[PDB]
């Protein structure tokens, strides 16, 4: 099995309060954390709406994870943490660790929501053909199936040989899928790190007692909190924006096939119905009544889902500490899986397929693909040797890329040249916000008129 | 007291960090300002922070970094050191003066002033005022905000004044529209029975409406109301 | 040789001064770049300039000036010192090698490389290339200039090509207009009878037309011709 001493390793990768608390402090003050405020989460950023951004979503996930950590360290210490050195202060480390990994889980995600990752993957699939001999290895899948978690790990480990110098416990916890593109395992269908981080992750696994396919136990908690935030808060945003009413959500949950005769769903429904009946007496505008009812529903649902996640984690702690763990997610082993699935279906039906969200996704895809074409015009061949990039437009677009990314690209290592160019493009695109990406796309499009034809 | 001290530390340190980040000043400029400050020449905390930052900058310059990148690295290290020192000083001051704080007859103004980091915080505030708060961009933003806020308050007062005092001067299409543009909760609180004077209720409604607005929302509402106010203004 | 050396000195020193003035780099950045330069280490002229500038900067730092003002004063003093040193080195090199310069078999390629200020000039050129010539503003200016120049050259070649060889593809209203927009003196020289080949004459007409234009005039003519070329383009 795995010991908590290695899993809570407070040693930092760079050779030489608490260290783990310092990890959260460093993550909060990082510039990309502030940049997260300008990246869309699901819905477009209006001038009046309080819809979640990447920063607000990350803070909410961090708060949920910190609450889970408080419950684990202050109430279920004997049931969860057995054979832990007295040097480790669980009450200070576990909540801080969970909060830090919750706040950082979406640092490297591209802008324009999920469509950002989708557009990056489609562009890389088209412009890095799998049949072409230049791109045949599974390593280029790192870009054909581009994932935000790998970019987040790259940012925290190789962006400032070390970046934020996070502790080994934190870095182990941020590895959502403990596998690479080259490694094929049925346990995880996504890669969790790039090829360029293969040496880093192998180091982390060495200092935490983890291995390929073995996931840090707190990663399950972070993923469960992420899913809970996604579902509940996207439903709340849908209600707030007026795309649906509180009664619509209640009917959807009640009419859901799985949420029927489900204890958690029924409990939440009855509590929300009683509170809504009480609220209806007060003379409020329909928007105000919907907001109050949705706030109470959010409180009840978040409490129930968090309690179910805690119970599932406590019951399955022995399996989580075993190297042969077959658990795919914490929610599915909890009593709140049906409610979470129903909430996700409601969000997909009413929020994700709304015309505003579809328009935002289409605009983001257009902007991302156009900017990637214009940047590839100045990136391709810089490392292989071919000099098609040496044009005034190519030199300008190379100079517009962030200096740190260019410095990492120009470093000498064992990465293949095509991989280095693709990673430079991915780092450039992923680190941009929505407004900055749009502005750069417009600038380059204005300046590309002559060279286009 | 602890919250106010943390607020002051955040202001003084991260405002300087933003000043360096935007290019309004350099890390060496901040170091020179702190060293040349009258009260920081002999201050132990300031001297320790300056010495540590000099030692770190002696190593950060070896690596090939852009001037902006080197400035950002040194600024981040200075932020870490200064925040650590100021927080430690604030904690020590709070622990030493806990009996005074727990007493009703407490005359302590702020936790920073009674701490050992007051000189460094004062120097940082002076640097922020001299380099950041009087920059062209900040002054232009303040002027634009003042113009927008005062114009919007005028147009809203056109529809708010007299609602509670019994007058009828608000009962115009523009007044009705601007009243309807106010958030419903503020209006609901405004239409309540209490001992507050009617003029006080109107002023509080205006203050609640203005305070809860964001920059973009305030600007958009001001522009729309200005567009719609053309006939009644003339 | 003297003119080329003066051109190089002006290029390096004054481009560094412009970089400092525009805010792309600081005076301390230039001092560190020169000090950390491999060749400028243990170089008499570079060390002399560095020490003089460091003393003057230390003296200047006492006066309460804005960071931009301090940078400007330090860069002005550095410009004075560096220009004086480089000019003196160039004079000494020219005087020492005057006999070789007066010989028909002179192998000297430039005056700077034979002087004691070659290392400082090379370091200044590298600094200008790293911080000034590769700045985003300069890159954008170069890209815009390349686009404008190439487009205008295409549109002018549409009306120039074949005028001297005999082929009459140029005899179109657009071709006649763009030929008429060329300066009359250049056209007169082009129409003169000499021994130059016809293709050479047409290319020289285009080169004379493009070279004699200023930036704003070239942009205006490019926009005019692009507006008038819409029908004939397709
Ligand atoms: Mg998330
Ligand atoms: Mg504050
Ligand atoms: Mg010249």
XYZ file of C-alpha atoms in Angstrom, chain A residues 169-438:
270
model
C 2.537 16.473 -2.145
C 0.972 19.322 -4.123
C 2.617 18.331 -7.408
C 1.568 14.708 -6.909
C -1.989 15.852 -6.208
C -2.224 17.969 -9.369
C -1.530 14.929 -11.591
C -5.158 14.182 -12.460
C -4.442 11.313 -14.872
C -1.226 9.498 -13.889
C -0.247 8.499 -17.427
C 1.348 9.911 -20.569
C 0.314 9.833 -24.218
C 2.830 7.079 -24.990
C 1.568 4.880 -22.149
C -1.754 3.202 -22.960
C -3.865 2.124 -19.983
C -7.549 1.269 -19.698
C -7.728 2.964 -16.285
C -7.458 6.501 -17.689
C -8.503 7.645 -21.161
C -6.589 10.946 -20.926
C -2.930 11.824 -20.473
C -2.040 13.879 -17.424
C 1.331 15.297 -18.435
C 3.323 16.164 -21.533
C 6.422 14.371 -22.768
C 8.572 17.315 -21.654
C 7.467 16.671 -18.052
C 8.155 12.920 -18.137
C 11.322 13.413 -16.089
C 9.554 15.743 -13.648
C 6.618 13.412 -12.992
C 8.970 10.454 -12.578
C 10.727 12.543 -9.933
C 7.421 13.311 -8.201
C 6.409 9.645 -8.219
C 9.805 8.873 -6.700
C 9.220 11.249 -3.774
C 5.584 10.305 -3.099
C 5.486 6.519 -3.506
C 3.239 6.822 -6.566
C 3.559 5.237 -9.995
C 2.048 5.208 -13.466
C -1.695 4.640 -13.281
C -1.700 5.269 -9.522
C -3.461 8.497 -8.566
C -2.894 10.555 -5.433
C -5.847 10.128 -3.031
C -6.486 13.872 -2.763
C -6.827 14.083 -6.549
C -10.100 12.175 -6.201
C -11.313 14.778 -3.699
C -10.251 17.643 -5.958
C -11.996 16.072 -8.959
C -15.169 15.466 -6.940
C -15.172 19.082 -5.756
C -14.615 20.233 -9.342
C -17.591 18.178 -10.538
C -19.817 19.417 -7.703
C -18.894 23.029 -8.435
C -19.437 22.504 -12.169
C -22.904 20.999 -11.798
C -24.380 23.051 -8.955
C -22.876 26.422 -9.853
C -23.608 26.061 -13.574
C -27.223 25.340 -12.649
C -27.189 28.448 -10.451
C -25.744 30.532 -13.295
C -28.402 29.171 -15.665
C -31.136 30.213 -13.240
C -29.539 33.624 -12.657
C -29.170 34.400 -16.370
C -32.863 33.608 -16.880
C -32.348 30.657 -19.231
C -34.443 28.553 -16.836
C -36.449 28.907 -13.640
C -36.076 27.256 -10.253
C -39.282 25.313 -10.901
C -37.773 24.100 -14.179
C -34.781 22.683 -12.300
C -37.019 21.096 -9.658
C -39.176 19.461 -12.335
C -36.098 18.271 -14.236
C -34.666 16.644 -11.110
C -38.025 15.125 -10.144
C -38.685 13.819 -13.666
C -35.153 12.427 -13.986
C -35.216 8.643 -14.249
C -32.308 8.027 -11.870
C -33.185 10.815 -9.428
C -36.508 9.102 -8.752
C -36.447 7.143 -5.470
C -32.980 8.577 -4.743
C -32.525 9.567 -1.107
C -30.248 12.580 -1.618
C -32.278 13.933 -4.536
C -35.571 13.521 -2.669
C -34.157 15.174 0.457
C -32.893 18.164 -1.526
C -36.167 18.429 -3.456
C -38.316 18.403 -0.314
C -36.124 20.931 1.502
C -36.113 23.263 -1.502
C -39.877 22.918 -1.962
C -40.525 23.835 1.675
C -38.164 26.812 1.481
C -39.726 27.963 -1.800
C -43.208 27.734 -0.285
C -42.023 29.856 2.645
C -40.338 32.369 0.321
C -43.336 32.764 -1.994
C -45.208 34.664 0.731
C -42.708 37.536 0.659
C -43.487 40.020 -2.115
C -40.500 39.640 -4.441
C -39.961 40.016 -8.162
C -39.880 36.706 -10.086
C -36.142 37.155 -10.631
C -35.633 37.780 -6.904
C -37.705 34.743 -5.910
C -35.808 32.600 -8.412
C -32.493 33.883 -7.045
C -33.425 33.162 -3.423
C -34.763 29.691 -4.218
C -31.691 28.873 -6.306
C -29.370 30.088 -3.542
C -31.089 27.837 -1.009
C -30.973 24.944 -3.479
C -27.261 25.571 -4.007
C -26.643 25.489 -0.257
C -28.608 22.268 0.248
C -27.213 20.472 -2.806
C -23.607 21.467 -2.102
C -23.933 20.326 1.512
C -25.451 16.979 0.513
C -22.938 16.312 -2.269
C -19.970 17.283 -0.084
C -21.192 15.013 2.714
C -21.670 12.135 0.265
C -18.181 12.696 -1.166
C -16.683 12.721 2.338
C -18.477 9.485 3.232
C -17.372 7.797 0.003
C -13.757 8.887 0.503
C -13.724 7.698 4.119
C -15.269 4.328 3.243
C -12.904 3.699 0.311
C -9.738 5.097 1.912
C -8.069 1.672 2.050
C -8.614 1.136 -1.678
C -7.357 4.652 -2.432
C -4.151 3.878 -0.515
C -3.621 0.692 -2.555
C -1.546 0.750 -5.736
C -4.211 -1.377 -7.486
C -7.047 1.123 -7.039
C -9.768 0.730 -9.671
C -11.901 3.710 -8.605
C -12.456 6.115 -11.491
C -14.107 8.963 -9.568
C -15.286 9.727 -6.049
C -18.781 10.864 -7.070
C -19.788 7.545 -8.648
C -19.003 5.717 -5.389
C -21.064 8.200 -3.347
C -24.784 8.511 -2.689
C -24.926 11.815 -4.579
C -23.969 10.445 -7.988
C -27.555 10.514 -9.276
C -28.083 14.144 -8.260
C -24.781 15.169 -9.851
C -25.655 13.341 -13.077
C -29.086 14.980 -13.194
C -27.559 18.411 -12.583
C -25.015 17.829 -15.353
C -27.788 16.792 -17.746
C -29.790 19.889 -16.798
C -26.762 22.115 -17.408
C -26.112 20.475 -20.778
C -29.748 20.787 -21.858
C -30.407 24.354 -20.704
C -27.037 26.053 -20.264
C -24.366 24.514 -22.470
C -26.621 24.326 -25.543
C -28.052 27.828 -25.148
C -27.580 30.083 -28.161
C -25.330 32.489 -26.248
C -22.978 29.699 -25.158
C -22.983 28.201 -28.658
C -22.119 31.601 -30.140
C -19.331 32.047 -27.591
C -17.938 28.611 -28.455
C -18.093 29.301 -32.196
C -16.376 32.679 -31.820
C -13.714 31.154 -29.587
C -13.066 28.344 -32.051
C -12.761 30.810 -34.935
C -10.423 33.125 -33.018
C -8.259 30.308 -31.657
C -7.870 28.531 -34.989
C -7.099 31.736 -36.890
C -4.546 32.871 -34.326
C -2.972 29.409 -34.290
C -2.629 29.512 -38.080
C -1.018 32.951 -37.962
C 1.355 31.928 -35.153
C 2.270 28.651 -36.871
C 3.249 30.784 -39.856
C 6.050 32.171 -37.680
C 6.773 29.154 -35.476
C 7.024 26.220 -37.893
C 10.568 25.358 -38.934
C 12.310 27.376 -36.217
C 13.692 24.193 -34.633
C 13.733 21.729 -37.542
C 15.951 24.034 -39.597
C 13.700 24.958 -42.510
C 13.547 28.741 -42.825
C 10.024 29.454 -44.060
C 9.511 31.430 -40.827
C 12.139 34.078 -41.671
C 9.669 36.651 -42.974
C 8.764 40.026 -41.443
C 5.348 38.662 -40.471
C 6.916 35.509 -39.049
C 9.497 37.491 -37.099
C 6.791 39.809 -35.762
C 4.495 36.997 -34.634
C 7.455 35.232 -33.020
C 8.299 38.458 -31.193
C 4.708 38.799 -29.983
C 4.951 35.462 -28.151
C 5.743 35.705 -24.446
C 9.472 35.819 -23.754
C 9.428 32.959 -21.230
C 7.805 30.563 -23.708
C 10.366 31.510 -26.357
C 13.205 30.993 -23.873
C 11.921 27.510 -23.045
C 11.548 26.790 -26.767
C 15.137 27.853 -27.489
C 16.570 25.673 -24.707
C 18.551 22.622 -25.790
C 17.025 19.322 -24.666
C 16.109 15.886 -26.010
C 12.651 16.881 -27.255
C 12.156 16.510 -31.027
C 12.098 19.775 -32.953
C 8.510 19.391 -34.170
C 7.424 18.652 -30.603
C 9.229 21.787 -29.419
C 7.488 23.962 -32.016
C 4.074 22.475 -31.232
C 4.664 22.956 -27.504
C 5.673 26.573 -28.094
C 2.409 27.149 -29.953
C 0.394 25.370 -27.249
C 2.055 27.368 -24.463
C 1.439 30.622 -26.330
C -2.237 29.902 -26.997
C -3.072 28.396 -23.595
C -1.674 31.306 -21.588
C -3.817 33.952 -23.276
C -7.066 35.350 -21.941
C -10.156 35.809 -24.098
C -9.767 39.555 -24.644
C -6.009 39.339 -25.198
C -6.456 36.492 -27.681
C -9.105 38.450 -29.593
